[PDB]
Ligand binder design. Structure first.
Ligand code: ARB
Ligand code: ARB
Ligand code: ARB
Ligand code: ARB
Lengths: 388, 388, 388, 388
């Protein structure tokens, strides 16, 4: 009945989230800029565990090494005053016009080198602040037209970049891992490594794959019409879910970044069920944008809503799994059999087993119902708190 | 000017393509069944190189071992009479009601064992006929609801299956490779390994990854709104493009399987440019369905259209790349620089290079246009045969 | 707490829904055919109010006028034995191969005439059984290619058909109205009158527009990525919501026809809120397909789930609107002002009002938050039954 | 062979198109602002016929009545110096924060009144410059959440606004018509009047429907996955195609506004075929954004590409229709029969015609192929200039 978050819930927010001024492609900003120090204080009051940032959110682009120090010092003091942590950091390789054709995969070699130096500088900072994960979102890596980018060469350049970052952290002895965040499109017509799948496949080709994982975002996979919980299960299956971005999205369209719980509510339920069941111990990070219709009171209400919805769904998912009636239903649908090996007896035994083919009653098997609809209605009842 | 295909073009068709009777979810069949022998003869006349099949296309389900032999014998004779080859074969693990919850990942263990035996039997046959690739399309592996399938267990079962198939071919000493064909949805609400990316990532977790690749289909990636040519470049980058399914699709909706060239015409152009530029030497396989509005004359016209469109696009792509004006444009857009390493000089040199950060003129770089629009218009002109 | 439906709730089902055998484009049927008489009995037991049918569901295609009479007689007796009504009926102008290019808009004139006679015959029957609404779903009206159909001529033929049906009912003195059911695609590449909007616009061009309305389906509008509740509000605004098809759909893909409540749960909540708030008094019709994974027990569980979910959402929507805290929030967001005329004072007064332009403080207005996020979280809390 | 545009081709561009600075949701501007006078001169040199504008493109927001006069005077002089016309004008009711919840349908009544006065002021200006059409794009009319907007009240407010604008022009005796431009989403989660269909239906409920039409945009209908040429045929069928926005879009995602010809090339071909065949005599307006990767040379190359592609497609469509082989194919596919009335003989005759039902050979009709694939391949050949 009580859905009050406490820092023990590991909820985190990006400075760019509650700090979003509301400037969209068709309109100017509707809110004033927030001082990173105020965001830290306001989020701490709401029960958040920490914050995340892009280099450019904390240190305005072009800042002298002294102004830079002053910005970090004020930020650090706010963290000390509140107990807030910084578990993840990332680089802004998308806002400045210089990155119009990308950062790591820009056609211009000099921009690629600049992108790398800018990243490395923020990695040093992230370690200084205690971040355990460094996210990379290649928002500008891609194209609007087919001849503009040779994807094989671009993937060579992307691997080159990530390999160099790996060589850097290992040489400095840092205890930080990287997490690639996929997105299918926007702002580029098509973005490289468009889904969790493409990102996982790419990681396996890096020199030190153990240092890289994924940072999936609910809305991004949904922009490709994919099943987010399924994508997350694959990332977990591969041991690559290093971090996660939670939010809401209403289908295939522009990247909405609605507060978590909004958008596909059922997918949110199945996601929380999976994260909790699987024992994900990383931060529950929210990458959302409070709609530009809101004033500051609306911004904090939206942020609070993110955490509240996660806590309600966590409760409902737990009750669902703990329900003896649901446990019986899971057996009726043979989820227990799915978890048993198909052929622990081995290939030869399978080939010699006449019960697996020659004498297999295909019609009898086909007549068995899976009982998935009853199971799904039990899930619905639990979600809506309508059990009886 | 002449777009007549010859077996040297490596164009192949599935028996199920020209043989599609036109039965869709809302209507009965509009054409009679085709004898596999007639399809072989008709395709040979059109200039095709070979055919492909599912076990069930060639041998009706439930056939006794003798009827089975008779079906294979007639088929083999048609191949001998025409010179047609069979470069790929696959299993039907989706039509029969027994596979309603999947084949390799069905919740019922006995169905999983049956699915494996059915596959193995067709692998023996495929080798006998000279197939070099065995495709696996898990059309029934997935779910309509969240609790029906634990994806981690399902991926364990999927790997188990593929690993056993790998152990089988290697023990028999067969020279055949597997190719997984992704699809995001339909007939299941969500299908496991939904895109080329997910398939490539999964392959890296198999015991003998060298035996597995992908069999991407134009329409399937487009059902997720993805860029097909980009997906193919990634598969090539990883050395996993073992086979390919060509067809057309008009955006995000049901799987249309239009003839190749139909659907996204520009994507077709960029795909052919890539396959030819990259030196793909596998079959140019068409997985299409002649619309149910057509009679048999329309079926052959549609099949012929597939090959014709590929030949026209191949011509246009070649002229595009061979155009000195296009070659100049590619340099103007720095495609040549994208192909050069970002830092062959190494990490330390990059860190010591002040021209990469401290003295990098970010504004000067940002002011450079990429000239992508002129390049894309040259591509358009070539596609439409409007150069001057 | 009790969500038991009673015939007073006006829940209806098509014979083709619970009767769906499970044959999809990639698989054979998984269930046996249901006798329309058994479906009537089983649905009555579940608390349904009535059933609907296509001519071909009740009378097998090709039936002699005597077999036809026998089928109707048995059906009528089942209705008499249960108290079940038949509020709507429709024609099957999509299954038979003759309708491969459409019914009312087929290119062949003789097929168009046949389609009309087949419809008229079922209208007589529908009136005999007491149906108040006759639905028309032009599933085959459309095309896969651009030259196959001249849409202006097709719209002339569509209007011609509907006008003739209007002339028929009015001449016979029938008290029945028509309801056009839109769908963007499937089974045709593109279907004519693809959304509720296109259907409403078309109706205004018929000779007797008062006889025609729409029969929107949740899943169909969602196949175009549209907001269903918004579409329904427009139909109500125009006085054209004659009937409605309830079900679930998971985004942009093939037509799923999931049980109501499944798919977009929040959209389901807003839909029920609207239908109840607006006083829609027509039947709550379900056009769904129990997944082919289910046996007969699963079919009835799925049907029951449709009605249950509607009753739960109706409860939650009512509590939401009745909540004084929500009523205050609605005022905070100026929903009350949206309901007031913009200029009841008239054009001249508006032009003379300096407070509307010359002295309008644009900055002060812009600084007002809309408070939509707090309002939406209250809606979420009510939906999940988490109020406190 | 020559695709040089001349003002006689009626090609027009919005000032906001070539003037787009490149600021997207994730990045700052990449180009400097263009003086409307320079755009007029540059477009005139390219062969354009005229330009269009939003009040705010020409007169910066907040301008005093004197600065306003100076901006108009300079603009008028550029038009006089070049011969360029201004056939259409529109209002910017989306950029300023005051319109965050809409213009005509904002919840705040005072904003609705302000939106009306701002529009009326620009209507006077548009008439002064000779515009024949006034476009209305309600980009901010809509919502991100369900309770924020009561759509029925919003439609009442939308009609109220348009009715008042109608009363205004008719009282002033202006010879100008309105054209509503639909868009399904972006920047709002869901936009009111989301497709051409919804807009046409709404128009029929206005007091003076004859004054209103539609201004469809290629990319917008495609953001809903709809067939643009079909939508245009319906608008023409209703006599409501007052104006049109041409551009390119790659499927369902954010609004790309690519140059015309880009995106769905085949749809572009069918669109031009329709506009030319139907005798559309309005301006061929381009609403596109030269990608932010381009410098000014790229901007003019992109603009020129728009007109070039239209001219090439116009040529190909004309050759297609003029081809005797295509004319024969159209007859083979019974396009000629589609154009003949279904029942000019009347209802009674149809009911008495036994050849329409009792003696109709349904099997013989069903066996006829439609020959659509051959027809579509002829269309493809013409498009690619590969006829032989
Ligand atoms: O998706 C967001 C992206 O927009 C940027 O903010 O950097 C990474 C985040 O996850
Ligand atoms: O996608 C098709 C699938 O429908 C089936 O035919 O087996 C594999 C093919 O590639
Ligand atoms: O959408 C369904 C359609 O599939 C058919 O059954 O007739 C009308 C219904 O509403
Ligand atoms: O779609 C564009 C819109 O973005 C704005 O510019 O006003 C109307 C135009 O058509």
């Amino acid at each position: 009945m009580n859905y009050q978050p406490t820092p023990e819930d590991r909820f985190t927010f990006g400075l760019w989230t509650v700090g979003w001024q509301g400037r969209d492609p068709f309109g100017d900003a509707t809110r004033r800029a927030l001082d990173p120090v105020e965001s830290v204080r306001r989020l701490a009051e709401l029960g958040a565990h920490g914050v995340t940032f892009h280099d450019d959110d904390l240190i305005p682009f072009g800042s002298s090494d002294s102004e830079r120090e002053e910005h970090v010092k004020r930020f650090r003091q706010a963290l000390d005053d509140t107990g807030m942590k910084v578990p993840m950091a990332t680089t802004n390789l998308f806002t400045h016009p210089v990155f119009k054709d990308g950062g790591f995969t820009a056609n211009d070699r000099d921009v690629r080198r600049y992108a790398l130096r800018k990243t490395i500088r923020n990695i040093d900072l992230a370690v200084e602040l205690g971040a355990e994960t460094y996210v990379a979102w290649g928002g500008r890596e891609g194209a609007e037209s087919g001849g503009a980018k040779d994807v094989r060469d671009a993937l060579d350049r992307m691997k080159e970049a990530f390999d160099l970052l790996g060589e850097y952290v290992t040489s400095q002895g840092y205890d930080i891992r990287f997490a690639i965040e996929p997105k299918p499109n926007e702002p580029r017509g098509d973005i490289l490594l468009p889904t969790v799948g493409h990102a996982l496949a790419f990681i396996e080709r890096l020199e030190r794959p153990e240092l890289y994982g994924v940072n999936p975002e609910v809305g991004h996979e949904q922009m490709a019409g994919l099943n987010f919980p399924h994508g997350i299960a694959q990332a977990l299956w591969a041991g690559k879910l290093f971090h996660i971005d939670l939010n809401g999205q209403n289908g295939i369209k522009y990247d909405q970044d609605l507060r978590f719980g909004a958008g596909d509510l059922r997918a949110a339920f199945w996601l929380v069920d999976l994260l909790e069941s699987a024992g994900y111990s990383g931060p529950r990070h929210f990458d959302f944008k409070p709609p530009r219709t809101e004033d500051f009171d609306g911004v904090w209400a939206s942020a609070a809503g993110c955490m509240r919805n996660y806590l309600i769904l966590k409760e409902r998912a737990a009750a669902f799994r703990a329900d003896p009636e649901v446990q019986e239903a899971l057996r009726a649908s043979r989820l227990d059999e799915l978890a048993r090996p198909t052929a622990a007896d081995g290939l030869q035994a399978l080939l010699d087993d006449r019960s697996a083919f020659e004498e297999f009653d295909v019609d009898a098997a086909a007549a068995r119902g899976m009982a998935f609809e009853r199971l799904d209605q039990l899930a619905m009842d639990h979600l809506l708190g309508a059990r009886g």
